[PDB]
Amino acid sequence: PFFDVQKRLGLDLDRWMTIQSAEQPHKIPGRCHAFEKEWIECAHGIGGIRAEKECKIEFDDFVECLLRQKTMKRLSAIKRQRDKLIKEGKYTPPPHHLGKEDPRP
Template sequence: MARDVLTDPWKLGELKGWAPLFRNPFTDIFGCVMTHQSGFKCQDFEARFGDCMEAYGPHRGAKECRVYFNDLMECSRMTKQVKRVQEMRAERKRQYKAGELKERYAPPPKIDAF
């Protein structure tokens, strides 16, 4: 099950850490390094979360924007995808040990298969 903003206090710290403490030209130049706005797959999720946080503010936004934040964290950390792959590997290992499969790993596709 995915973690929620309200149940994980450490994520509330992530919500409040979006702006630099002191603004200067270096923070303006290198501020885009820690975002997903440079053409990555999560840029839409971050934009929705940023719009929501801007609309509600940091205190109320922690509650109102938790869905957008959870979507952004899932996109950037891929926890569900990693869990799904682990479950598939465990099931294949179980089937191999139980004798349901003759080979532990599936054969690779032929070279010109694509």
């Protein structure tokens, strides 16, 4: 029994904090503002049943932005291979990656 008195009376009581793509103070953007915006715009009025399948790509990318699980997996794989190569002496981290070369401003 979601008595949506908010929409009936046109009063926002908690919809401001429902999503991170909503207006935040001083226009401070959310970390995954773009992805959430895309997902919401895709799944607007098409129904939850259709949204679950049709807008799957948007939500998948949004979750990847939120948790960075696949990105972390890729970075961990790179780190593991790099460390393996270091143990065998088949790789030498470049001086700029070693910090020898000064960074750009």
